[PDB]
Amino acid sequence: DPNQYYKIRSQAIHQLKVNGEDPYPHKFHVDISLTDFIQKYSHLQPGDHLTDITLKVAGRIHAKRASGGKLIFYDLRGEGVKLQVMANSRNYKSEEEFIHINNKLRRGDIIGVQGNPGKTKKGELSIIPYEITLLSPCLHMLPHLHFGLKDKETRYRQRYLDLILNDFVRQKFIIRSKIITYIRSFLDELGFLEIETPMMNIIPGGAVAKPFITYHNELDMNLYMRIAPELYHKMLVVGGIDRVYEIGRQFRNEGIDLTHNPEFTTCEFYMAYADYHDHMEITEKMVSGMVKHITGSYKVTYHPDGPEGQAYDVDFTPPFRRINMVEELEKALGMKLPETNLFETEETRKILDDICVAKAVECPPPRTTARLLDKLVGEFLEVTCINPTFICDHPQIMSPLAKWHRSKEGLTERFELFVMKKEICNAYTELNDPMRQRQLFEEQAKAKAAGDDEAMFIDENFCTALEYGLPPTAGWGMGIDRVAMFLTDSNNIKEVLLFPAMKP
Amino acid sequence: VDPNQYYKIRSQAIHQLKVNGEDPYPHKFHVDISLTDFIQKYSHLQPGDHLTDITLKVAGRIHAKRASGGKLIFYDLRGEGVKLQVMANSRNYKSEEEFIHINNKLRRGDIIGVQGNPGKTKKGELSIIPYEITLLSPCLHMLPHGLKDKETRYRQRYLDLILNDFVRQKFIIRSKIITYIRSFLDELGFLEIETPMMNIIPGGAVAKPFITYHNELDMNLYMRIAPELYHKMLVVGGIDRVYEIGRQFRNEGIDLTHNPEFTTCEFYMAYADYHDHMEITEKMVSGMVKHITGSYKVTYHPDGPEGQAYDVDFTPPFRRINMVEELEKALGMKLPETNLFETEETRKILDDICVAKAVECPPPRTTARLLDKLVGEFLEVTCINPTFICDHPQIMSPLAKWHRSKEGLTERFELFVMKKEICNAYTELNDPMRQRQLFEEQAKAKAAGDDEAMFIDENFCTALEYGLPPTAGWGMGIDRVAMFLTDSNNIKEVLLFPAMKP
Numbered sequence A: 001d002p003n004q005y006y007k008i009r010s011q012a013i014h015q016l017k018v019n020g021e022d023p024y025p026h027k028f029h030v031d032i033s034l035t036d037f038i039q040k041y042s043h044l045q046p047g048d049h050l051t052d053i054t055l056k057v058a059g060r061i062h063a064k065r066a067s068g069g070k071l072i073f074y075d076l077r078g079e080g081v082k083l084q085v086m087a088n089s090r091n092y093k094s095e096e097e098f099i100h101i102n103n104k105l106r107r108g109d110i111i112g113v114q115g116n117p118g119k120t121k122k123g124e125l126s127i128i129p130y131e132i133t134l135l136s137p138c139l140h141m142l143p144h145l146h147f148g149l150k151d152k153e154t155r156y157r158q159r160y161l162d163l164i165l166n167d168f169v170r171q172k173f174i175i176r177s178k179i180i181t182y183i184r185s186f187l188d189e190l191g192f193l194e195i196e197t198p199m200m201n202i203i204p205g206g207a208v209a210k211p212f213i214t215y216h217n218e219l220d221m222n223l224y225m226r227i228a229p230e231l232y233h234k235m236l237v238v239g240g241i242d243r244v245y246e247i248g249r250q251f252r253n254e255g256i257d258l259t260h261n262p263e264f265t266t267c268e269f270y271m272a273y274a275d276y277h278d279h280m281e282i283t284e285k286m287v288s289g290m291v292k293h294i295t296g297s298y299k300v301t302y303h304p305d306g307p308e309g310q311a312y313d314v315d316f317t318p319p320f321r322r323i324n325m326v327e328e329l330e331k332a333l334g335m336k337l338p339e340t341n342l343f344e345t346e347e348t349r350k351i352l353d354d355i356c357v358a359k360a361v362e363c364p365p366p367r368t369t370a371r372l373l374d375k376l377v378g379e380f381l382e383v384t385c386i387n388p389t390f391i392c393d394h395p396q397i398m399s400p401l402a403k404w405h406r407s408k409e410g411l412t413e414r415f416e417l418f419v420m421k422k423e424i425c426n427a428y429t430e431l432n433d434p435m436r437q438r439q440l441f442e443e444q445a446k447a448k449a450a451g452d453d454e455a456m457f458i459d460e461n462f463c464t465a466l467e468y469g470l471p472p473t474a475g476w477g478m479g480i481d482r483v484a485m486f487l488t489d490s491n492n493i494k495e496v497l498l499f500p501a502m503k504p
Numbered sequence B: 001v002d003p004n005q006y007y008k009i010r011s012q013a014i015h016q017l018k019v020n021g022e023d024p025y026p027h028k029f030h031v032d033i034s035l036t037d038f039i040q041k042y043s044h045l046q047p048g049d050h051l052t053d054i055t056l057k058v059a060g061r062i063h064a065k066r067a068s069g070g071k072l073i074f075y076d077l078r079g080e081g082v083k084l085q086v087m088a089n090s091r092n093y094k095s096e097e098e099f100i101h102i103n104n105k106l107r108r109g110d111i112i113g114v115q116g117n118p119g120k121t122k123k124g125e126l127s128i129i130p131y132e133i134t135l136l137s138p139c140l141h142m143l144p145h146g147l148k149d150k151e152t153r154y155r156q157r158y159l160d161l162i163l164n165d166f167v168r169q170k171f172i173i174r175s176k177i178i179t180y181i182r183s184f185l186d187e188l189g190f191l192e193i194e195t196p197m198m199n200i201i202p203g204g205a206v207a208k209p210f211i212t213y214h215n216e217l218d219m220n221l222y223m224r225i226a227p228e229l230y231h232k233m234l235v236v237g238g239i240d241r242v243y244e245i246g247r248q249f250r251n252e253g254i255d256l257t258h259n260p261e262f263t264t265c266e267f268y269m270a271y272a273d274y275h276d277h278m279e280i281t282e283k284m285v286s287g288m289v290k291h292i293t294g295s296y297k298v299t300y301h302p303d304g305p306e307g308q309a310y311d312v313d314f315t316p317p318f319r320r321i322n323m324v325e326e327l328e329k330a331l332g333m334k335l336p337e338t339n340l341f342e343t344e345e346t347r348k349i350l351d352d353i354c355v356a357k358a359v360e361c362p363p364p365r366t367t368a369r370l371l372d373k374l375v376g377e378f379l380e381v382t383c384i385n386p387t388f389i390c391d392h393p394q395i396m397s398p399l400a401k402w403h404r405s406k407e408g409l410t411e412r413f414e415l416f417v418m419k420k421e422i423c424n425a426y427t428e429l430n431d432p433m434r435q436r437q438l439f440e441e442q443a444k445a446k447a448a449g450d451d452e453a454m455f456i457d458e459n460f461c462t463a464l465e466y467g468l469p470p471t472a473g474w475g476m477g478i479d480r481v482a483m484f485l486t487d488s489n490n491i492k493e494v495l496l497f498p499a500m501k502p
């Protein structure tokens, strides 16, 4: 049936073209939006019909229900709003044209309506047409009215169908766009300069991740899509721009799940003369201010198991709870780990390997200390973070760009913010010692030769830039898509991306 | 001393500080007041003043170090695009012994923190008289004594930003351009959106794409050449006004107006045509210039600082010209009628004209590419003032709607400012059957050698079959705007890290 509808209607539209009835006209002058139309005329009473007033509106027909031969009702929708078109024969331009236009219209068509405001006897605000014009015909059958567009696959591969039929979808992407606008306002007020840095790199850096590779024909050159803008931003602080930020796309050649898309949006900012303690206060102020400004409360209802699951109230009232990674993991495991100045030994790596096997937490090769630690932290600590929680003082061996902790040997001045069991922020006091930064780069290169696809390349250009003097600096990064996730009560990142990445 | 030996000497000294526990890279320095706020708060003092009442802490980079006998040193402290003098006096320092110790280790380029009192030299220089100077980050290299070489400026942009304050102003202007556009469109009800930068099939422009591969999904992907197709699908979805400031990627050569990655603004407006967008462009571009510059006039130096200067007036209305007629005027010849611009005889006529007028066109010598070369040689070079070039032939606009009076042409315009293309906009083609036919012609051109021809996007065609309302779209090169608002003839001047040959 849907296949035959498409052929029949495609035939009808083609006949209109050759009949000189252009079904795709160039311009239709809209006098008033549907939203402004309702707020301007909702006050009317049943039976009213303002003959004095004539406006032109436009939208998509969601339903067409005829009653007699001289009267048809059209469900006109647009802007997330609805308006009824009460097409009467005696009010139309002519009786012959009234029969002609109604024979041509179908559900799904884009039409323009010129007429008078009115209200039906049943109490529906309506537009009484003098002339209806077909603007763009719909050649397909749209999902039936009883049950419409629930399958996840079609909603994500035809997002325009999702937006036409489900008005909860358009509200999520308004929220997501309100989140980003809030960030810019927050940082612009603080004197940060919004900058743009290359997304194609001779050598990628700024995170531990597998990159996408590409090739430039003219330069006969292999390039990588950026995994993070971190290194370029620190070069800007060397250049004397003490506060920079950038909201931009990152690309990571990794697997898709409920919180990972191969391309995603982050905000990174860098502030001269601040440390990671300063960024804990800024993070609290920004996240809490943003949740309250978007939702309307400092509390967010969160459904980990879908609508028919448990509901958890997440409180974003500062200050957020802080836990030290290694110290709290000793508590969660119920055993003492080697002291932090021993984390580079092989005896320590096999201790953490044994713990992973004993507690069944699982780790694909290479089974590095840093990777085993990350798996243990995810299993025992990150799952307990429902409320916004800072996990602090990461070991140096998992933080190649973070400055060493000023009191705790083996650790760094780093924190991550976790909300509703997922990582939201990553920030630390920046390592500005160029000699120590080279040593950590050369260790990353050995890890890569030892199997880690995510280990960092040696970036000698960046090390040279640090030799010109980077002031004491603290940086910060946040996954915007994950923020939109917990602010729209979405457990699937595909819900907050307009066109998520999909298998063919 | 040699720069290489300077680097070795200073690296050794710094390393000696590290192993002796002297911490040349301290973790945190509490700054009490910014240099800018220090100057406005204390510019009012009089020559000779020295306030014992006030003790603040500032920080910055040493740009100069001139001794005045041994008990007095002057430091030129810079930061935030501003300057402040540090009058290091021996009798005012923490101790005479520490005064000699800190000044002997400090060099030009170092990041330092200064705790002291505000003051003013007898000559009238606002100064801070330090009680204690702290080294925050040493500079291990010799900085240029200026820095005018273009290759070094573009490969070490941090050196450019430290030494040249006209560079820092250009990038402040660029961010003011982007912030202005967002304010302009947000006020008009546009929703800022994000659309995929990795595509199964690239589209929305005529360009050669970058190719990549996703391992887990075992899939070849392309970096986007434009977001146009995704935006129109959102208009089908009922979001009547969308826009996006984002990066585009084009596998082509670098020149004075082309970078392989660049930033554009694209917006799409339901129920508007390209006539509506010409007025929006006038309002936005003129308003943007005046809010940034302060007037509607911008000085333009096509031949560098030592060349002629032209005052470019951005007061609306902008001049409008029709592409084909003005190209016929420049050529001194009549072209075939516009309804013949897709025939092979017309391509052969344009081919002959290109050789006769010595305008080169690398293969394939298609009508669209020969026309593009002719427009670049004869029309686009004469556009100094903001100029609309309108009504492009359909064969150069596979996504633009046909012109309602002139068959063979489209409802399209481009904005040219100071010899550069700035905007591209047209009434969107929303006939799905006609859009498919033009996709099939582009596909044959690709099989005929054009790597820049468009792929057939059946997903987009399917979306057009659900009904795209009459719509007009618009695209602006952000980097190209920053070029003519900073009087830059080289796009590398308005990119923080431009693409360079290795």
Ligand SMILES: NCCCC[C@H](N)C(=O)NS(=O)(=O)OC[C@H]1O[C@@H](n2cnc3c(N)ncnc32)[C@H](O)[C@@H]1O
Residues within 6 Å of the ligand: A206, A207, A208, A227, A228, A229, A230, A252, A254, A259, A260, A261, A262, A263, A264, A265, A266, A268, A423, A424, A425, A426, A427, A428, A474, A475, A476, A477, A478, A479, A480, A481, A482
């Ligand atoms: N200078 C301090 C660190 C600054 C940020 C640092 N350069 C960085 O890249 N940190 S990150 O953990 O690798 O990414 C930052 C956030 O992006 C989010 N994100 C990360 N990977 C993905 C993926 N694959 N998909 C979607 N969202 C993601 C996530 O919430 C991170 O907290």
Ligand SMILES: NCCCC[C@H](N)C(=O)NS(=O)(=O)OC[C@H]1O[C@@H](n2cnc3c(N)ncnc32)[C@H](O)[C@@H]1O
Residues within 6 Å of the ligand: B204, B205, B206, B225, B226, B227, B228, B250, B257, B258, B259, B260, B261, B262, B264, B266, B421, B422, B423, B424, B425, B426, B428, B472, B473, B474, B475, B476, B477, B478, B479, B480
């Ligand atoms: N729907 C109407 C058309 C919308 C815009 C369309 N998607 C498009 O891509 N137009 S474009 O001509 O191909 O690019 C838009 C602008 O980007 C600028 N630009 C284009 N290519 C480059 C390159 N290589 N480098 C730097 N800047 C560039 C240039 O000013 C263009 O006017």
